Amino acid sequence: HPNLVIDAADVDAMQGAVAKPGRFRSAFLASKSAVDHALQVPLAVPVPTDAGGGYTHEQHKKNYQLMYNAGVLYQITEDPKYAERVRDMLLAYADLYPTLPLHPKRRPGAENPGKLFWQSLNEAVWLVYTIQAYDLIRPSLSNAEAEKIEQGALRPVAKFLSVESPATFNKVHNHGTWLTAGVGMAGYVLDEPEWVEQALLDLDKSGKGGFLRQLNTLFSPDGYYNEGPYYQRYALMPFVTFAKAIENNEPERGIFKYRDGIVMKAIDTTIQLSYNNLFFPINDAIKSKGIDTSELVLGVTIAYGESGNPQLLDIADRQHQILLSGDGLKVAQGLDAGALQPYPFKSFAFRDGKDGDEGALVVLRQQTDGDQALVFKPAAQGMGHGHFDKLTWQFYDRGEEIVTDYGAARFLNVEAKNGGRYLQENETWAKQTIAHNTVVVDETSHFDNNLKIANRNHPELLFFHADDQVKISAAEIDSAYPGVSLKRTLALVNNPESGNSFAIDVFGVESSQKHQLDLPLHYNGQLVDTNFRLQGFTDSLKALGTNNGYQHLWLKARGKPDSGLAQVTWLNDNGRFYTQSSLVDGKTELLFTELGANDPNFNLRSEKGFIARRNGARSHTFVSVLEPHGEYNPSKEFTLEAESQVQALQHRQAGDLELIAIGIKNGATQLLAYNRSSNVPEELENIFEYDGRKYQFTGRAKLFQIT
């Protein structure tokens, strides 16, 4: 009876593969050992009393996982003990569920209620796994056992998640995707076709919500999910699960061709939104989440099963987790056959919006100086999970996040931390603009915290270009603060001769009115030196400000460099020094902060940053260069080039061109020249004059060496 993600054909293929040495057999033996041990322990289907991370919540989660794993073993081995365990647990659920009220630890202000769980989302995950387990063990049951499980457990849960909470079922968000996927698959297993249609087109079958609306709205043409990478991988699992079930049940729907293969694009982009295996922590996001997460392990197997792309074996190899499925077997076989090819992590502008015209998530990468990623976020809001952070950036180098995004104020599945829920400081700190590396006007967050306006306004991607020496993008938004135009261009560059790299930042603010302008740099590392006088406050600390996140920042020190070049140098665990060299006009303060004020429940990390503060400016440009330099090896006990190699910095406008000149110690000046305007063909010619000589280049941009 398996006919959801796994079908009978997959079981027969798995049965043959299990008795041949290889990755698949070894994964099978490991699952079998674990399930056999778990079968020794009595079933635990407790009355639900705990919130996220609590015993009842985690036990119910463990139950769905065991029921799925045992069902897979039952199909492969034909051993009845696996089905009997799944049956006994389902009979227990069938007796418990009808008697359950809404969860005692429900918090409806945060999320909709569940019966098994504090929130409906976990119940939806439970249905997605449990329906598959039932589908896998259904041939083992008597008719009365099936009827009791369906009438007491499966149908009441399907009803609870759909007709009984219809607003969320018809919503176009990850929570909707989980609910639609579970009820739709239940429609297939229990022969309820209307449930499949309700999953695809909403409860009214209108078309306004449902699975198809989600695929047409939440993803851009580049496969980029509007809520961001961390919820991208989360929603991926019900997308590829229900899509695999649609293809096995109604292949005439052409689900894997729908919207020009959007399901495959979505899988691939999920992989791309990572560095050193971790998803970029933009918007609401837990920084530990990586590509070995179960949703992307599954997604890769499904995409490899559809395409046979050997590049996906590279990812599967890094995930270190063989799945007991037909597609999981295909992955295991390609790996055993040596078919692996490297996976191409791209510099790319992943467009945002269903039509691709609501900004973009830009990733700039280069390997000349090690693994480096500059992540630029001129993206749309991302809805409730979105941060108020237009044009913010991050910088990754040598395995580590150097210029940082906080992610969410949330301790996942830690019940003592408010049931693992999003904390108050996720609104008052983590979402605020001052928590990001982008301009804050008048100590006020972008859109002044107005969700509806934020949801309707987005930056415009002006351009993106990437070649071997220059990766560069610019974007603009005039709606973050009406009357203020915010424009940023960021370049990731490398010089082949030196082996050196730079991140270059040109942040232009233009207003007809005077404003306070803050540009934070939140960094990871230890402050080691400054160009200018800086002594920290010594016997008391006070918060930087009063609202919009400023109330959480302790002010540790205040500097006001003389006009010219300001330099801030820190040292990272990864063995590198980082110096930001910025142009200051003598009216710019540098405020050094530590996160942790107005934090009575110890909910925030002691993160460090410095803010460039320019008061009373109508128009201002923040020009800066981030220089990774030197080597620090505390094991062999040597240090090289600990001092910044930048001596001078100049920024000039030359018609439609922007020039950034970086003077290097005992070295040639690095001169970034790029064309500023919208459309620039690849062979367009440019010249300009710098220091009495003439320079010429084709296309968007060129880095010159001036000896």
Add this chain to the structure above:
Amino acid sequence: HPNLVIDAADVDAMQGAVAKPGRFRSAFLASKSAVDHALQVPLAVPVPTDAGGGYTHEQHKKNYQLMYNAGVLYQITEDPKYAERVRDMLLAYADLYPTLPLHPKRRPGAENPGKLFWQSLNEAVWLVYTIQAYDLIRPSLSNAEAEKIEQGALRPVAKFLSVESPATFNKVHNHGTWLTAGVGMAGYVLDEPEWVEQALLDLDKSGKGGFLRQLNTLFSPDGYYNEGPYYQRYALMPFVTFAKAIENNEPERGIFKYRDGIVMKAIDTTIQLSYNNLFFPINDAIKSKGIDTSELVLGVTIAYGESGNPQLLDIADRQHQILLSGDGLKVAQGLDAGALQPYPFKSFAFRDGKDGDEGALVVLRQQTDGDQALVFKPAAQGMGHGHFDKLTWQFYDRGEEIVTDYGAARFLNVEAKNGGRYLQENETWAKQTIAHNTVVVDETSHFDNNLKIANRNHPELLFFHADDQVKISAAEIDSAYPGVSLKRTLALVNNPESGNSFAIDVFGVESSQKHQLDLPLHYNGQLVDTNFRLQGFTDSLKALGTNNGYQHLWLKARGKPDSGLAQVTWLNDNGRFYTQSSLVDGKTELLFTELGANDPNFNLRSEKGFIARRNGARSHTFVSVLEPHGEYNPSKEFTLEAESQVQALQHRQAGDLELIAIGIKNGATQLLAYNRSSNVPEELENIFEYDGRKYQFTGRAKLFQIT
């Protein structure tokens, strides 16, 4: 000509091994590649201008490293390009060194000056490496080149390091070992036997100083170096280097048998004083230093060449660094031959003092619940790098430091941080007792920071016992504070029935006068719960105190739990929760701190801790249990047992016995019973009554399960 660590026998064996494939050939090729690349850069022997971490400091360090490596490559390849580079660098040193003043960035308060370097310590390392390089390339030289090199560089350096700085040269400390090693090896190479004898017996050759006194004084009979693990590995290099040269030139001295084989013991104990490859950060210490440090890579090859112990190959394998020497070949061959045997990290009391009577460094390990180490420090002062930390402890679990020692306030080889020197806050914070996990009386450090009193006093180790279920040690000191006695016993225990483990702490304070008593607990991880009301200060922070390190702690929160059981729970990145359960009397405050006050140069990390404070006590006992519990997996997204499983705690005396009974939720109480007397035969019988039942055990201690 090579006759020091490397002799001609070694060279011959290496030459035949570099043709055959294997670990040695791969190391050779990697070295040859690095040096060949170095040879294409012209030599740089600059006039010394910078302090530690600066250009000339790090260049002169690069130079001795390259001279040694190029010299070894000369001997193996017989290719004069390597010797010619070494020759040309030494001729530049011969011309430069006699013109040199004392170093312009000398800081004679911190360390004695050098000429090549700001301190003579680096000059001694330079000599140790360079005398070996000169020895390796000598047969390539003309007599006039040899005379110029010896007259202008080698002899002036050796003379500057001995007769011109005689106090330090005759000193018995790590600075002394480096100086005497270089001069003694110069004595062998330049045929100055008086220098060899001065190296072994001091300049006046009295025997008060010198290398034999160092081996007889700075190590205990257990091979524990008095200054601590971080300086043990430092001194280990000159110790084993000179010893190996002595054995190759004067094997009649039997140096590897001297003092019951102290050198081999010294190597083995250096390996023992680590957890997950890092040395215990006690006394002045840099936390990143681990067993791959060059001194211990060398010491392990030399011990393997002496003893052939296949267990040393385990360490070598973990170090991942084959050495181009005769011993390093033998190590590579044994590894290739698959002779590796697991190295045994033991529970052990490493005695302190020349004769092993000045306290001890006690390490308790178990493996039942993962890799765990309890480090207890009832040790001698350790001279000027010693910390004021009698009876302090650390806890390590699942790869991480959980209960912490700060180590030193110093940024090794970062010139912008005071030349990589020990910083002011090393004295005012890192050495202070409040920075450690031990009792502070009246906000005053042990011995009141008086180094002369501290050097004359040490705790007495009372007992130490390790079996598979209980590891336990106790010690006491009555001289840390006038009229106050301090006694601590620490136990590491495991229960087989559950996978559970506990660290048990009983800290007794006895005095005829009332005092304020502080017991800090410095922890690594995120605070997640308390069983008593705790709200952090929200709008400002102020230092906890005014002196002896209290001026560096921000007080973030204050709690006063009710009489009974206090519980503090934090979450560590290793995926485990930790709960300290402590007995409190309603009069004990718990103060939550963050390091960072009075730190104007950003010299301190933001470390966290909590302090149990009890005022007006004459005698008081701090009883607590540290419980690692649960699993936190944010990749798979599950949590198990996040809540502490301790329900109750009781401490009782029963004659010569102490009882600690730990109530477990849904579990048998764990009852630790141990005899307190110094003398306890293994077959001694103990009997006590607890809750109506009678219990008996043989020997020192036993953990009982009470259902």
